[PDB]
Design a protein around this ligand. Sequence first.
Ligand code: ZN
Lengths: 63, 123
Amino acid sequence: TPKKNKHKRKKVKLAVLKYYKVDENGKISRLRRECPSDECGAGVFMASHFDRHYCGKCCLTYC
Amino acid sequence: GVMDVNTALQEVLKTALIHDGLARGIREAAKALDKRQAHLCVLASNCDEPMYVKLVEALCAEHQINLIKVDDNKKLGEWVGLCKIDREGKPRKVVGCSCVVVKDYGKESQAKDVIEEYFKCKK
Ligand SMILES: [Zn+2]
């Protein structure tokens, strides 16, 4: 192949809206699983994939 | 009580540059707010989606979290101190963050003088 392309970052604009489901009172439905790590607990979510739950920082994984 | 709201606040925007208070942006403010070290906040009304402002408000209400309202982040580019200045000291890239959180306290006597008075009147 004469032209090898590289990794463009996926342009997803304003996605922290999806991270926090603010209720109509002052609550937030925290839709994403919190990571139980020692380094990155209590502030860093995990990733709701189609079957699994994955932290990105310390590479922690659940089903 | 000498300085104003947008006068004593440039000291809030001073030591966060020095001793690591700036939780600026969209992901650095809230995701480190829940780590019991963040202290202040300034909401900026500029939004094409009002949910953005609605995000900040419930975030201010889950750990009795402090808040100021200064208008817009096009204005806050002339406040925070994160601008590309020219050869004479004139900013050409004028971009400042809307929601600016300051975690740590370098202990002063003119920012906590003026602005804690406005804090107790608000709450
Ligand atoms: Zn993890």
